[PDB]
């Protein structure tokens, strides 16, 4: 019922300080293929899941999506207290326990859980994030698909702090509803690593983030500290 993305107002967030901790199992996650969709970068995965949290049961990882802007100043989708990061990784998970496929999960408000990891541009070359920029040479055209070149552990792309905000919203392209898990703490990357994304053909792709929507009266943002 809430269109994504949003500005998260920390002063309005509801503290849920009795939740089970969030359990991330990316040890068995393996990247299958990488896509240039013409609009964004998609990395598909097999294996790996997340458990609650607020989660009624576990949700399997299916894919990763990357967003940026034309400046290292302004590129993420979600904001926190009107602060926009350089970029945003979205990790899509689906309710395989309840529904037979992703396609059936995408039609329900308890089918998709998306994890948001922010990208902060600094003077720090991320060796783990690099494993992704290297793939970019294979997928410059649109829409192209290539096998993910070599060894990569998603676990390395996790933030150093896993406190998070959560709310019921939608996919970034609005195609379906989804619950968001959003870490305020970003991972750090260099300008040289992000700029590579802007050299992908879109038919020229300088920016692909979406502006935020007003929070609806009945939309709650919960914080797990």
């Amino acid at each position, epitope marked *: 019922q809430q269109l994504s993305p949003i500005n998260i107002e920390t002063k309005k967030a509801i503290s849920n300080a009795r939740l089970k901790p969030l359990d991330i199992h990316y040890n068995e996650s393996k990247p299958t293929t990488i896509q240039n969709t013409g*609009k964004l970068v998609r990395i598909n995965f097999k294996g790996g899941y997340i458990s609650g949290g607020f989660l009624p049961n576990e949700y399997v990882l299916s894919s990763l999506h990357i967003y940026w802007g034309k400046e290292d100043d302004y590129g993420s989708n979600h904001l926190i207290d009107v602060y926009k990061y350089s970029g945003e990784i979205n990790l899509v998970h689906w309710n395989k326990k309840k529904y037979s496929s992703y396609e059936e999960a995408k039609k329900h408000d308890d089918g998709l859980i998306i994890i948001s990891i922010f990208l902060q541009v600094l003077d720090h070359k991320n060796v783990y994030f690099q494993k992704i920029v290297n793939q970019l040479d294979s997928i410059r055209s649109a*829409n192209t698909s290539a096998p993910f070149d070599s060894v990569f552990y998603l676990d390395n792309l996790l933030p150093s702090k896993l406190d998070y905000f959560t709310y019921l919203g939608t996919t970034i392209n*609005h195609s379906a509803d989804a619950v968001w898990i959003i870490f305020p703490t970003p991972i750090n990357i260099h300008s040289d690593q992000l700029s590579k994304f802007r050299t992908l053909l879109s038919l020229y792709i300088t920016e692909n983030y979406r502006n935020p929507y007003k929070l609806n009266d009945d939309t709650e943002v919960y914080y797990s500290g």
Partner: antibody
Amino acid sequence: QVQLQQSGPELVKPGASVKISCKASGYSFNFYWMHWVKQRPGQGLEWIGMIDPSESESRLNQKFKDKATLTVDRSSSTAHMQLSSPTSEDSAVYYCTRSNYRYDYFDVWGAGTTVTVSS
Amino acid sequence: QIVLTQSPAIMSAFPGESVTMTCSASSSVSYMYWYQQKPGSSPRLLIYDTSNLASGVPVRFSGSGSGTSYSLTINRLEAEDGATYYCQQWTSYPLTFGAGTKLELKR
């Protein structure tokens, strides 16, 4: 020029499926959501649904769930809408319109395709 | 779904007169959008984000409102403004339009 070119007037036999088309030119087709809008002689504008061209992910108005099927031909930069088992209620003008990737408005519209369902 | 009620259904005024048309929503809308459709033509953006004029829209047009109540005003009507005007919300899916205000001219 940025332009949306729609197929010509369609006479459709009741119960006989129909596909109408919307060819985009002048811009990057994959980058903008394409929407379909229905207009009946006396019934205002109705949003049928939209499709994200980059991955063909569509969202349909539940009112048109079993009626309209939204597809795209990325190679030909053409969005399609199929109407299944049409009735006289499906007679209308159908617009394709592009919404801006950043601003939530419909910045380009086709001339509309008139569909008459009648025997 | 969010239902938008447009009043009046039909109206007319002389050129130079001020015209106000309202769009009422069944629940709160973040921003209202306005489309102008001249007879025989496709709809065309007039106002976006409640009160921003689309490129080339004459300054006699203005949009206003918040919550469940919004309006479009033409300050000094001109004959070429004869059209049906639709409000539209982008707060929840499905996207919905009002049934329109048909505006015609007096002479």
